[PDB]
C-alpha cells in the first residue's frame, strides 16, 4: 500500500505524485488514519464512562450523552482537517460530542459556546512543538469557561522542540525535530491538502513571502 | 453500504441505528464520489486561468503555488466538506489556499468571524459552503466579499443544493449533491451541533428538531 520512490530529479514520489518541497516522508495517509482512529478509540473509551454538569435537564451531574455531550474545542486554522477526520472516528466509536472553534495566530476568533462550566472539554490541536500555543489556549479556556476537566489531543508531538512544559493527554503521531508539511501542516497556507506528512527542505519556509 | 430499517422501523446503515432519521439521502460512498467529481470540475475550470501576481509583485500570472486559487470556507457546517474537497483538489493538482469566515442570522444576516486574507483584489475567489437553501446566507457573503475584497472573479461550490428552499435567486456554480426539501443532518449538517460527525446525510424526523433546546 503506497508506492514511495524518488524520480531522476531526486524528488520524492508517493503514488505517482512528486513533492519537490519535501526532504523526507514522515507518514503515509494509511499510517496517519490508522493512528488517528486508534486515538479516537482511546478518547471514546476514556470519556464515555464520565459524567459532568447537566445543562439539558436542570442539574446536577449526568453522563456524557447526546443531551450533555463532550465539548471539543478545535484550534483553527491548523487543526480543521485533523478535526474533520477525528470527529468521524469518534462518531464510529459512539462518543457523544459537539465541536466549536477558536482561531489563534493573538486570538482572532472566540468560541460561541457559553455553557462549558463544569463540563469535560477536549482541545483538538495540530501539533505541540514549543508548547507555548497550548499553554496560552489552556490558560484562556480554564479561566473563561471553568471546565470540570480540560485535556488536549494533538495529531503530532515534536518532543525535541519544547521551550515550556506541555504534555498532551492524547498523541496520534510523533514527528521528527524538523519542519513538517502536509495533512494540515503548511508553509504560508501551502501544502495543507497533502494526504501524507513530509519534512520540508531547509530554507523553503520562506518560499512564499507575500502576505495572502 | 447496507441501508435498511430494524424491527422498530429505525434506519440502520452498516449496522448503526439512526433513530432521529426520517430517510437516508446519501451514503458516504455517494457523497465522496460526488465531491471528487466536482473537485475535477473545479480543477479543470481554474487550472488554465491567471490573476493578480502578488508573489512577483507583477501584473498577472497563472494560478500556481506562488499565486494560488483563494478558497473561503463558510464555518461551521462546511469544515468537514472542505477538509475532503481540498484533498481531492490536491489529487487533481489545483494550487489553492483556504481561509474561513462565519455567518449567522438573527431573519437578517450578521458576520460572526472575518477572513484574515488581506490581498484578494484581482484574485479568483471560490466560496465553499455546506448548503444553499433560501439563498440568503450566500447572497450576503457574495455581496460582502465582492465589495470588500474586489476579487477578479467570485464563484460558489456547495456540497448540497435544496432546490425548493429558494427565496432569493442563487445557483452555485458547482453543486456536489441535490437534497430533498427537508431538514438534512449528517456530514456537517446539525441539530444544535449534534449529528455533524455522521458519514451519511439523512432527512430529520420532524419531532427531533427541538430535542436539544439548551444553548451550548
Ligand atoms: O513543524 C511545523 N510545521 C508547520 N507549522 C509549525 C508550527 C506552527 N504552528 C504550530 C505551533 O504554533 C505550535 P507551538 O510551537 O507553539 O507549540 C510549529 N511547528 C510547525
Ligand atoms: O437542511 C439543513 N440542515 C441543517 N442546517 C440547515 C440550514 C442552516 N445553515 C445553512 C443556511 O443558513 C443557508 P440559507 O438558508 O440561508 O441558504 C439550512 N438548511 C439546513
TrEMBL record, chain A:
Residue ranges of domain Phosphoribosyltransferase in the record: 66-184
UniProt keyword annotation of tRNA processing present: no
GO molecular function, one term: hypoxanthine phosphoribosyltransferase activity
Entry annotated with the keyword Nucleotide-binding: no
UniProt keyword terms in alphabetical order: Glycosyltransferase, Membrane, Transferase, Transmembrane, Transmembrane helix
Highest rank taxon of the organism: Eukaryota
GO CC terms in record: cytosol
Any one of the GO BP annotations: guanine salvage
Record's signal peptide: none
Protein's name according to its UniProt entry: Hypoxanthine-guanine phosphoribosyltransferase
Amino acid at each position: 500500500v503506497h508506492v514511495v520512490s524518488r524520480n531522476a530529479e531526486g524528488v520524492i514520489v508517493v503514488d505517482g505524485k512528486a513533492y519537490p518541497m519535501a526532504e523526507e516522508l514522515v507518514a503515509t495517509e494509511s499510517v496517519i488514519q490508522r493512528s488517528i482512529k486508534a486515538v479516537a478509540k482511546q478518547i471514546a473509551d476514556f470519556y464515555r464512562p464520565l459524567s459532568h454538569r447537566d445543562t439539558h435537564g436542570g442539574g446536577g451531574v449526568a453522563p456524557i450523552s447526546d443531551e450533555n455531550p463532550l465539548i471539543i474545542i478545535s484550534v483553527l486554522k491548523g487543526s480543521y482537517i485533523f478535526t474533520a477526520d477525528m470527529v468521524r472516528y469518534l462518531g464510529d466509536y459512539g462518543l457523544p460530542h459537539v465541536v466549536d472553534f477558536l482561531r489563534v495566530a493573538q486570538l482572532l476568533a472566540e468560541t460561541q459556546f457559553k455553557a462549558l462550566r463544569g463540563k469535560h472539554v477536549l482541545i483538538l490541536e495540530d501539533i505541540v512543538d514549543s508548547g507555548k500555543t497550548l499553554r496560552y489556549i489552556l490558560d484562556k479556556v480554564q479561566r473563561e469557561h471553568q471546565p470540570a476537566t480540560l485535556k488536549v489531543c494533538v495529531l503530532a508531538d515534536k518532543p525535541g522542540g519544547r521551550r515550556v512544559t506541555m504534555q498532551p493527554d492524547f498523541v496520534c503521531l510523533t514527528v521528527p525535530n524538523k519542519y513538517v508539511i502536509g495533512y494540515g501542516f503548511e508553509v504560508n497556507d501551502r501544502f495543507r491538502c497533502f494526504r501524507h506528512i513530509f519534512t520540508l527542505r531547509p530554507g523553503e519556509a520562506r518560499r512564499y513571502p507575500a502576505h495572502l
